[PDB]
Amino acid sequence: NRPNRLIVDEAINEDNSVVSLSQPKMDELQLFRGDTVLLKGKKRREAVCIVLSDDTCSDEKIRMNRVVRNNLRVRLGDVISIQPCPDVKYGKRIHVLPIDDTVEGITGNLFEVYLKPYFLEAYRPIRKGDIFLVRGGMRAVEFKVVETDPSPYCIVAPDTVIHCEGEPIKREDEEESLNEVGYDDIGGCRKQLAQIKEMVELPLRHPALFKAIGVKPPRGILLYGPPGTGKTLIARAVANETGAFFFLINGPEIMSKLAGESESNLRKAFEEAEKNAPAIIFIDELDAIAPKREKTHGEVERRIVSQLLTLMDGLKQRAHVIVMAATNRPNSIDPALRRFGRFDREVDIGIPDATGRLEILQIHTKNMKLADDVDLEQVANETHGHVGADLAALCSEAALQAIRKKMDLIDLEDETIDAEVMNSLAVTMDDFRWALSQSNPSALRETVVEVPQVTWEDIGGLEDVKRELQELVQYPVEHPDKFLKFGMTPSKGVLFYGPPGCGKTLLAKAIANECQANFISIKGPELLTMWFGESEANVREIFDKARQAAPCVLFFDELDSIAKARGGNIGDGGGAADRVINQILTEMDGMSTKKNVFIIGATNRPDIIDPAILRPGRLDQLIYIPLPDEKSRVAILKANLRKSPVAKDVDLEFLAKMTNGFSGADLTEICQRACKLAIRESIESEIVPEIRRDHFEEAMRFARRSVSDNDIRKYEMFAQTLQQSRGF
Amino acid sequence: NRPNRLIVDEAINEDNSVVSLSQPKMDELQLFRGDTVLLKGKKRREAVCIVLSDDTCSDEKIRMNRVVRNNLRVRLGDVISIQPCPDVKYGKRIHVLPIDDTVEGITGNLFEVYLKPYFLEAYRPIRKGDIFLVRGGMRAVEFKVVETDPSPYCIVAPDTVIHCEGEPIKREDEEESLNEVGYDDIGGCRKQLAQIKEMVELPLRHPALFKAIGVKPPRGILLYGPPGTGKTLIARAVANETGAFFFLI
Ligand SMILES: Nc1ncnc2c1ncn2[C@@H]1O[C@H](COP(=O)(O)OP(=O)(O)OP(O)(O)=S)[C@@H](O)[C@H]1O
Ligand SMILES: Nc1ncnc2c1ncn2[C@@H]1O[C@H](COP(=O)(O)OP(=O)(O)O)[C@@H](O)[C@H]1O
Ligand SMILES: Nc1ncnc2c1ncn2[C@@H]1O[C@H](COP(=O)(O)OP(=O)(O)O)[C@@H](O)[C@H]1O
Ligand SMILES: [Mg+2]
Hints:
Distance between the termini of chain A: 74 Å
Number of helices of chain A: 27
Shape of chain A: globular
Binding site for ATP 1 (chain A): 227-233, 328, 364
CATH superfamily of the largest domain in chain A: P-loop containing nucleotide triphosphate hydrolases
Protein name (chain A): Transitional endoplasmic reticulum ATPase
Oligomer: part of a larger assembly
Bound molecules: phosphothiophosphoric acid-adenylate ester, adenosine-5'-diphosphate, magnesium ion
EC number (chain A): 3.6.4.6
Radius of gyration of chain A: 32 Å
CATH topology of the largest domain in chain A: Rossmann fold
Largest sheet of chain A: 5 strands, parallel
Family (chain A): Belongs to the AAA ATPase family.
Organism (chain A): Homo sapiens (Human)
Helix content of chain A: 25-40%
CATH architecture of the largest domain in chain A: 3-Layer(aba) Sandwich
């Protein structure tokens, strides 16, 4: 249907007037990447913009910003027409003025702060119907053109004289503000937007088709995640972005109201928003109003949760609605709300990663001006547990640390301030380092699921067991073609066992990095404290959080501490078991081989373990991690100092010889002392940097075999037969 | 912006009429540490005080007491002007009288208990607009001067004959009492005041700037600690000291 029909999509780049396409559309287009284009759009309102080319788009799709996409009165997923035409020319007048409340409280000269610096060397097209936004000085400014050089197009040149009175504008009746949230105000969530985006999209954009079909569009959604994670943000974003009518319910709000006042208040919310459909209904803190465990005292609270049910279930299809609620943990809410015809969908919005945090940090760092020494790629690596709302108050508190010490000397106090200071005001790296050091980065910290940073090169030796792990994880994910042809079935779990400090934890994080699978780590002590006094109930959740993360490596680390809890050494009269070992391996038997979740245990004392976990179908492959030997003992040293400035004098072949029964962790203990003996001489020297050969000679003096000899023969005995361990 | 612009700060020393500065401001100043200075301040009300020098202040900052800082109608973090001038001279009359309820229940001779022992060998400047406080006898006494030797300055000498009827005064409509809590009535908390002090300060003193900016000033605070630790004290102190309107639940 011709290359006059294009679709809307949301840009990767942040720049104001551009559109990004691909070469197939270019081999359809045959026009430049420096050209101007005049686009046609809905409601007789159209606008002028330029194009470039790039791979991130598909064969056919169109990247835009909101500032473009709003004037065109279009939304993501609309048919647009680029109209590839070269009308190219300069314009003349281009008289602009600021917008109603967008300048409220800021005053003064706008030429050198705003406007001018935005146009320079990047002449930007303009039309009588372009509103645009300029970022700076802690503020988002909005503009409009009542007249310019006559239409359609005007293209600035590094001359053109712009003239502006200032003063507000009349607020446009229907024209949205750009300060309303949209898919660009959310970051780190990319994967769960597209999930929410598909699922809610077409029944909002295409109310008719469903009325034409017998398909039931899912209507109800539950968003998980700990507080401050952006649940309420993601909700309103979608409602704005999709065009829907967004009504909002607070839990406390309707539990604040008088008994019997809530019922009419909760009922009206649907009844009213029934009339305005298509409609979103968002319920903040569903936990407040529907808390069924031992639930509540007295009817009036037990009554309102049954009112909610008869609205969800007793929804007859009404006309058209979709309900969205939010809560901190999936639990604590009445189970009867998750049945079908009620909130059947679930979207778990976890904490962000560093790649997510940098995405967030840039969003709250946009509008403000920064010094050149800032990094923000390092910050994301120094903020560990942080949700989005922590990481926003880390930007706004760092920026108040800047404007206290800067303008206390200016000490100017009046009704409003103008932009020159703000423009010549910046935040430095010393502030971020300061606001990161307060207790504000105190933040919620719980089970994290991520792709690990460790690579294969980060571990030395072990080259064959590296080859065997990729057999057992890489391939069944890579080649589902095979394993049908030859039949059989992949084995699910693995068990590493060996001397302490020999590399088991690392080698589990390496394959996750290799297959880009998520990695969940559950350490024996942590697992056994949540059992607390005689109760846990959270184990089934780490298998859930593993299930919705697939492909996933699920790693049970230092699995020996649990068995020695029941008892170690001499031993009890009984075997080594707890009620938290049993509910693990009921749940292993639960997960299907069609799942690509993959389990790995590790133990430093194979002597003690429960045979139940070795049974075929639980942890079958047994892998014995030996101590390193000379040629590998170089690989270890060669590795962990890869970031250390070692001097040329050293012989790593020589270290590796004098050492024999050292663990890989104890080699790092030598390399550790050497480096800390270096810094003592340097610090002395303040009354030259480079690790020295003599240093390694002194460190090597105090080195310590971490594993005894007489216990090496014990690993060598279990290396042979640990299969025998079950049955007697 | 010239060495006529100084800022307010809270003194380390406890003595009544002094101001503490540093040498960089002195190499800006070039006047004595025994001199008298006449300071200018807000609301057309100003007062006379003397200076010394010390390290505890920064390069540029000014230590005061509340008894100075109130007459000037200023609060910590205001631009003040010291006006380094040597007008030095003695005065003559200096007639003082006690304040409305500040003497309630205490009576009798005030000469040998109050007043006199406070002036001795440490002649203290005085102006028609100085209210001062003397400590002793389980009580905090407050005074004022309706007239003295003509203005601006009067500087006592170890002679000058003060005369006082006694009797209350009319309670000044807006003039704060010195018995209200302030940062000097709290101790051992120095480190967590400065924390609370930064965090609440500018959005109270500068309501406008935030209305001019997109920054969100944190508004809500939780104070921990076991009972009797001074939580309620620290709260009202800040409210008084910062000027804010303090409601209590
Ligand atoms: N092959 C190896 N390559 C690099 N580092 C190693 C290796 N083996 C041990 N290490 C060091 O040991 C530390 C982590 O040891 P792990 O890989 O967890 O071995 P582990 O025996 O499972 O753990 P523990 O605590 O020593 S019982 C790392 O900081 C490494 O410096
Ligand atoms: N993914 C994200 N991207 C950008 N900002 C975020 C994100 N997650 C959280 N925030 C920040 O969190 C703050 C409030 O989050 P909120 O919507 O209240 O989450 P919740 O409702 O889950 O508590 C907002 O200021 C927003 O800036
Ligand atoms: N840091 C402090 N400095 C001076 N006085 C204190 C301090 N902490 C407590 N007090 C004394 O405690 C008394 C009452 O404390 P209060 O304000 O009731 O504390 P809270 O409200 O925490 O119980 C006051 O008389 C005050 O004299
Ligand atoms: Mg380990």
